Structure 1
Amino acid sequence: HWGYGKHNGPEHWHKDFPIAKGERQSPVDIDTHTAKYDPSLKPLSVSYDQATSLRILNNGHAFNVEFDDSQDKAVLKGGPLDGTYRLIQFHFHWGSLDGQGSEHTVDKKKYAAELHLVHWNTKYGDFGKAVQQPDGLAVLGIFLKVGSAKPGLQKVVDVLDSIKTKGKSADFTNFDPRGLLPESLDYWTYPGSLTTPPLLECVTWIVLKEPISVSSEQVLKFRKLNFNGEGEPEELMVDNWRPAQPLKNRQIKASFK
């Protein structure tokens, strides 16, 4: 099934998911010179004080930190959005080396990794219904550069040994995602898609301008994860990023001058 090898990676996905060649696919390259400042954009409202993390899962593609999304406890609002979007999970994409790993690029620059905080529009009731709608999801994307450690990341890094292989989970309560945010909430936004199959065109992307810094040691621990299941040939979970897709008939808008 789909993955990130030679035989099953991004360049193959269209055969099972023809929307891979669609009009609003993600990620994209962000051309900072052509993204226009939109004064009508609002500040983003990230309200994570009541967030309830529950579990961390290796799904064979990344690891997900899952939240209780049965009430409006961690929500994203404002920005480009109408209405309220509940946090369901976050996950990352990363490289085999520090010079690649992000999905979005900035003037063709690849970051070492990219964090995706996935939220669904409460007007649709549940995640599965929301992904069927063009305004169903809001994904907050945050770039990771290698430098100083991110203290708030370390709890995640240190549990990864317990979820080495596909289908492993571990309890992961009381994790505060605020510790993964940069200082500024300046952002770019555009309409796009899930970046893994089924590649549904249901996402308002909000990509923060300011990266977070993580240490080399932190990203090295991401790269010890496995795509494979327990006792299968080990294949390191690295390069689990989809490359930039054609922008087509879209505009990327900036919240900032």
Structure 2
Amino acid sequence: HWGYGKHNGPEHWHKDFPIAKGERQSPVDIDTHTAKYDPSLKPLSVSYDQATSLRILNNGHAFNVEFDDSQDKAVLKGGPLDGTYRLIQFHFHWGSLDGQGSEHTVDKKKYAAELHLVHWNTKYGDFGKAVQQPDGLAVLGIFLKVGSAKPGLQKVVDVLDSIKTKGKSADFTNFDPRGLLPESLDYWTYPGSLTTPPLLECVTWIVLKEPISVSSEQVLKFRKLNFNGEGEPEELMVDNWRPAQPLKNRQIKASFK
């Protein structure tokens, strides 16, 4: 099956998922000098006050913090978006070392990790319908650098012991994703894809310029997770990132000067 190893990693995915070589794949390098300020982008609206987290799952590629998306409780709107996108889950991509782990790059700089807050367009009714549409998803991408601890991440770090292996889940209620946001909502935006199979070209990417800081101890706990199932050979869950893909016929827009 697909993964991040020598025999099933990103350079192999195109054999089962030919859209891997498509016209709007993600992630990309963000060339900060070429990105155009777009004075017409509307204000970005992150409304997470009523968010309802339910569960945390190790799916064998990453961990997902899942939300109740059966009503408009946690929504992303404005910026480049038309209409209302509902938070369904967040996950991270990270490295074996602090010098790699992000999927997007900024002037070829790699961050230690990247948070993806996944939202689906309410006009398509559910996530499965939304991923079939070019405007189905909005993913808020946030870079992690290693420095000071992020207090709002520790509740996540402290549950990972309970979901070490593929297929393990744990109750994860009352987690506030506002604790993972940087001060500034200045962003870059472009049309792209899921960065994991099935690599569907359904994402409006919104990548924040300001990283968040996490501690060395916090990312070490991410690196103790396993890709494998319980009672299988231990394979550390590290380097679960796809490298930068060709930009092709796309323009990256900046919300800021």
User: TM-score by structure 2 length?
Assistant: 1.00
Q: Distance in 1 between matches of 2:70 and 2:110?
A: 35
| CA displacement, residues 193-249 of structure 1 (integer Å, 9 cap, x when unaligned) | 000000000000000000000000000000000000001000000000000000000
- Separation of aligned partners in 1, 2:110 and 2:5: 19
RMSD: 0.2
User: Secondary structure at 1:162's aligned position in 2?
Assistant: helix
| 2:82 alignment partner in structure 1 | 82
Asked if the contact 1:30/1:107 (under 8 Å) is kept, the reply is: yes
Written as runs of structure 1 = structure 2, the 5 A alignment for 1:174-253 is 174-253=174-253
Specify the alignment match of 1:55 in structure 2: 55
Q: Secondary structure at the match of 2:12?
A: helix
Partners of 1:216 and 1:24 in 2: CA distance? 34
SS in 2 for 1:10: coil
Q: CA deviation at 1:123?
A: 0.1
Deviation string for 1:30-82 (max 9, x for gaps)? 00000010000122100000000000000000000000000000000000000
Determine if contact 1:43/1:185 at 8 Å carries over to the other structure: no
Q: Which secondary structure state, in structure 2, belongs to the residue aligned with residue 49 of structure 1?
A: coil
**1:6-44 Cα distance to aligned partner (Å, 9 max, x none):** 000000000000000000000000000000100001221
User: Is the partner of 1:76 in helix, strand or coil?
Assistant: strand
Which residue of 1 is the match for residue 125 of structure 2? 125
Identity, % of aligned positions: 100
Query: Would you say 1:5 and 2:2 are equivalent positions?
Result: no
Report the 3-state secondary structure (helix = DSSP H, G, I; strand = E; otherwise coil) of the residue aligned with 2:99: coil
SS at structure 2 position matched to 1:25: coil
Q: Write the distance in 2 (CA, Å) between the matches of 1:236 and 1:155.
A: 21
Counterpart CA distance in 1 for 2:11 and 2:240 is: 13
- Aligned-pair distance for 1:122? 0.2
1:166 and 1:107 map into 2 onto residues whose CA distance is 34
Give yes or no for contact 1:55–1:172 (8 Å, CA) kept in 2: yes
Separation of aligned partners in 2, 1:73 and 1:84: 11
Distance 1:150 1:2 in 2: 32
Find the counterpart in structure 2 of residue 93 from structure 1: 93
2:140 match: 140
Whole-angstrom distance in 2 between the partners of 1:230 and 1:43: 46
Distance in 2, Cα, partners of 1:22 & 1:234: 34
Shift of 1:102: 0.1
Moved over 6 A (4+): none
Q: Which runs of 5+ in 1 are unaligned?
A: none
- Cα deviation, 1:84-134, whole Å, max 9, x if unaligned, reads 000000000000000000000000000000000000000000000000000
Please give the secondary structure, in 2, of the residue aligned with 1:11.
Answer: coil
**Partners of 2:217 and 2:205 in 1: CA distance:** 29
d(CA) in 2 for partners of 1:163, 1:36: 42
For the Cα contact (< 8 Å) 1:101–1:112, is it kept in 2?
yes
Q: Which secondary structure does the structure 1 equivalent of 2:139 belong to?
A: strand
Unaligned runs of 5+ in 2: none
Cα distance in 2, alignment partners of residues 42 and 156 from structure 1 = 32
SS in structure 2 of the partner of residue 217 of structure 1: helix
